[PDB]
Amino acid sequence: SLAPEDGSHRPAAEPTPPGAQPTAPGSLKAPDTRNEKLNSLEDVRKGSENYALTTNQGVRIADDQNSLRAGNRGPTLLEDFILREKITHFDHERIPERIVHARGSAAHGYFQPYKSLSDITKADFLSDPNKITPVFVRFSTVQGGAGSADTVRDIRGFATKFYTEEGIFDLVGNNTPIFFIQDAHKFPDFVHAVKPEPHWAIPQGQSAHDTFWDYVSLQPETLHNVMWAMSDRGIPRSYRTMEGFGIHTFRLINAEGKATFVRFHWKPLAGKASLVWDEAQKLTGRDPDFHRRELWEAIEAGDFPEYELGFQLIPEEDEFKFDFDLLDPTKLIPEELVPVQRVGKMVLNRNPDNFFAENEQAAFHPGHIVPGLDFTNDPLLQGRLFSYTDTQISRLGGPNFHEIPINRPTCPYHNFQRDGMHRMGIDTNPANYEPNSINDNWPRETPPGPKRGGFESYQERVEGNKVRERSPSFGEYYSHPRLFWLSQTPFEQRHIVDGFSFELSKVVRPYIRERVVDQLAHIDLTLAQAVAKNLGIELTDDQLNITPPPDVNGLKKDPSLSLYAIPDGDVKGRVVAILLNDEVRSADLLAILKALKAKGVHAKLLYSRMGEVTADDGTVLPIAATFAGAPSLTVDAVIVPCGNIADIADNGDANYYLMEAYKHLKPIALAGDARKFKATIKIADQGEEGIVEADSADGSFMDELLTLMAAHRVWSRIPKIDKIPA
Amino acid sequence: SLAPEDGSHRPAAEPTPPGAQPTAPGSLKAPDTRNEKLNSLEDVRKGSENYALTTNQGVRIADDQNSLRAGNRGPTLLEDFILREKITHFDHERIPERIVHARGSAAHGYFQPYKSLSDITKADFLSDPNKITPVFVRFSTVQGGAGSADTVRDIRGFATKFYTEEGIFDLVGNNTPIFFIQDAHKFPDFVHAVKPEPHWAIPQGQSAHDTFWDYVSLQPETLHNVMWAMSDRGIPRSYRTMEGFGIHTFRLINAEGKATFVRFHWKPLAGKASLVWDEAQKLTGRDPDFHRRELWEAIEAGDFPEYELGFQLIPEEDEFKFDFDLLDPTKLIPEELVPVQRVGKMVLNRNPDNFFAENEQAAFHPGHIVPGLDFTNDPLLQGRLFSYTDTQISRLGGPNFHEIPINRPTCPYHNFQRDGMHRMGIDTNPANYEPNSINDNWPRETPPGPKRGGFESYQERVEGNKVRERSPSFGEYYSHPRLFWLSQTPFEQRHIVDGFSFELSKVVRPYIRERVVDQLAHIDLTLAQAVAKNLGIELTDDQLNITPPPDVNGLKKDPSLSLYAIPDGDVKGRVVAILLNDEVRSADLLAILKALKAKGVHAKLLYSRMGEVTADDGTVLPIAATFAGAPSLTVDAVIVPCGNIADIADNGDANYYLMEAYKHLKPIALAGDARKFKATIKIADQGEEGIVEADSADGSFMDELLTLMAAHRVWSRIPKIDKIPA
């Protein structure tokens, strides 16, 4: 009726590259992609086609265009129950956003272990290489609201809901291996300091303001995670190209009752990759939804995000083996000292149907563990256990949040709990208490055991007085920031310097900048001096003579802490901008697209207008976006084929497209007379590494380009970009 | 004591220009700024200095750094009531955001009428020129969440709470004179279409997506307000430089019972000023809080936002004398036919103390009127009256939202309502019903009268059948969009074309773009043709033969609809970037700052690092921000004094500063050897209009620059900017 005659409104129910088709609810885009959790949601999924429009009570609506009034130009009547029901539901759509991590993007998937881990844990989802566990994963920022932007400088959340046969296990982690603070009692202080300031509620999604750096300067325990946030780790290219960490030391418990200390890791199969600051900041304006969009479209394209689960394992007798306290969440465990042992793989392969119902209402909580796992006395973890249950009473409207469909266990659950707001389950048990005789005491307790047993805490020894006191072993603040610093490449170190420098320049009270620079001088004097230089601060002789902190158990570096030191690039799922002209050389475009498709690299055809152009072939080329509509920020490299280059040679948008990408260190490839654009980016006739150029886009032209893309960015270009006006 | 000895942590409690000092709660920044509402809030204002840190129950806390645990490396104890109270409050901080207009910034102020209006309304706050009414005003966007960006393309809200002696009057308006839809029954449809789409919750703060333009293409009633949104009205420079409108026709009722139709207007004393799209979009990334910050800092500087309240007045016998229906909210009343008559002045002169408590919790509702005002049968207004009461039950936690301090009337309030969540008032009335004898029927009804009388509705005639039916008089959709289009300058028209073009290029389904272009052809074929060519669309012969709509009561143009046809910009409160070098020519800087001060124009001194530089005469210049930290987006003009120009001539950030300013049509002034920068912006030796240049910054130099600033932007430069790579 209102759909177009040609059916061009519906996306195909098959994988398609980003921007090819309109995005769609997961059940409509990929109906053949299934798992036990997705199937269990069938009871609450609602269709639409061939159904009448009704009230919520089932009454068909004849006229959904008008209120009921006395005369067609008269007052609206109170008896219009259809209008009032519709407006009432609208009026109450919103619920409180998460206190932290309010901005997030989520997807369905499954996990599978590589081998049985029965020797170290009795957890059922790790017991058998053929046990598939559905998952729901939500990635997030930390500071900003649910409507804030994606590519901010911040920590990222990485929360995984495991729907196991013995209960929900929530692995609630971040993208760095430590947190800012040591004891949960300080969590409201730290969060209030990083959040928008209370008088005017500025700034959104940014730590670059006085109260954050005030707190940091007075609490050196924060410096380690601050180092990570100021590095390019704070601006990932994609949720698909960052690491995950549980941060805390947990425990594994095997059938014989032996405990092993464990820290959890997620390693991205797509490799580690981050933006650079100028690109990330501008991208929050050009596309505040970039990461959300990029995740959704990768899944629709079949570039399923994949992550390997890994364990750092520490025997109980090695609790005190390292310089740092194992239970201190501001300290990491270097992989040089304790390797990450691979455990299994997780694949995210379907988007939700309704963002609010599945993402916004999802509730993750690290206290949701299962038999075979346990906690430790990490005093940050200890307080988290209180928070994630408590907070849901207001956010999700009461204690039945486990009945919201996305949150439901796929395994059975039965107990004597009753009532509460929006109670869905109707209990037939004659008893609502135990011990009872009137239902023969069902449901019954289960003794602990090797499988399908009841939960019992590990009986660890407790000895001490009731004290509010920090462990002295936690009182070391500079050695891990320094190890992180020393493990970065030189260009990563420069980016850290520029992060501190840019943020401290937004601090209005100069003494705070100075006090932060003083803390940096306790970490590394090269770092401190470089930041000071950019702030017009001069270190004193006392600061220049601060003794550096000790090495971490003899380490001078750990290359696993760098994003880039150990190559792990993968071009699959990346995207290239192809800048068209009105008579493209079809031979160039043919060879370009063939090579990109063979490596799984997507392309977007850009022009100065929408519609189509015709190549020299007579081939009609559809235009994905304009140069301004899809800035170089949104792509990984730029290719300019030959053709009628005079068409775009004096186009300001086209020339700036290349300058912006050049500034942000991206690979650029120019064919034929497109090489004339070298003048725009101040490249000499002789060329330079990172600019592919040839008479035509044939032979090794695309191999060179794809090799550059596998290395992510052209770091050697950095000394040249400070002269580029872009 | 953690504060610096020199007291530099504390801003001065006197007016200071933007950036000079840290911002502060209004009671601390401007303690002497008072009004009756601000005084009435004193009962709930909390101090801090010289108080002990306590629990919410008043118990002093000894150690706010640690949880209570069994041993200093032990588990946290459930008996830690201090921890659990602190974390519980943190866990429940967030409340639901507003369904629409969730993003907004507010201030305190006062209103005064110019003359008694007793002849046309018995409203007490308009009865006496010596009667001052306190106000609380919230400006907002519409689509995005509370954490979204300020300078988006959107309609803006302009809500004013008048605390009158006869009750609260809320004037809840927008910055355009019409709304998108005719009947409130369709509000959830329109809002769902513009909001982030439901499968993936994209895009934030943007109408540039499929579902919005789908709805528009199928509901031509939306086209008038769409035209306004696509113009530079949709991207204001500042809440201080936009207009406000009540949109609906309301009624004024005088003491003799005579009704006059009225539409409400706010006219900014700072004049009308807007950004351009590329600037606004980039600014949502460089400073998503730009409007919130600019409002707060203008008030701290003494640049108080001021607006003139004005009335369009139509006698009852003139109801049907126009080509359009007065009760249709998609139609404006041209000022050429019905002039805005000046009524009074509103000054916003103090910021809040706590954003959440005063801004986030404020509740405005257009059903809050007072005797002397009444409604009409406008079917959008009619449904609004239901919604603003209903929505607060969830957003503010129940029916006692009028007891939240910011919402409280300053006049008396007494009735027989009782109980409800968070009930504050403790009633002593023996009776909670009327009629009653046990309290001699107090509080009592009051007959209507000329002053201090009870509210009685105007007894307008109602005749017709109970129908869900649109008024035939509303069935015209193109003549007011055409009137707006033909009232704009040629460069405003270009920006409208480019607004439609940019947004429709982000619509993935091409037939939606085609259907919108077809709607445009029913408005004006020059507009339709210009948009279609940017989309690669060819109008058909039939489309080129669509008859345009007629003039609106003889009007092709109304001058009041253009932002700029008659410039009315005050330069006071604007800001100029001054690009420093390491040996600035002090004679230049003296002349520059002398002239800016005389016009109340602020300055920010920028450089490549923070700290200080020394001028050629030894003056130490403090640096406000770096070139990258305070981009040209954030200022109105750029001046480059002479000095050691070689220091910055090769700086890529400095050159780009000018190129970005140039592209966005801002005045630029270059003294002495700084004229070398003309090459970067491709200005010929001979000069051009909008680039001020001379051997030195003298008297004539700064007059030319400030004359350009008075005209806001250099529109004559538009033909040159498409060749600039920026």
Ligand code: HDD
């Ligand atoms: C004692 C308070 C407290 C502390 C110390 C932490 N958190 Fe937390 N976190 C919360 C209290 C909280 C919360 C208030 O309970 C949130 C907000 C809303 C919610 O459901 O849980 C939350 C949300 C939250 C989310 C978002 C989950 C989602 O997508 O819904 C993640 C990923 C984390 N946290 C991760 C961490 C990590 C890695 C921490 C340090 C190791 C951490 N949190 C410390």
Ligand code: HDD
């Ligand atoms: C029947 C539904 C409905 C309709 C047709 C409208 N609104 Fe509305 N408006 C609401 C339902 C609503 C609301 C849902 O009740 C809000 C959101 C939360 C709230 O407190 O009120 C609101 C908020 C709201 C605000 C923000 C107030 C603040 O700062 O808190 C403004 C300025 C407006 N509206 C203005 C308008 C204008 C100028 C309209 C057309 C002439 C309009 N609204 C139509």
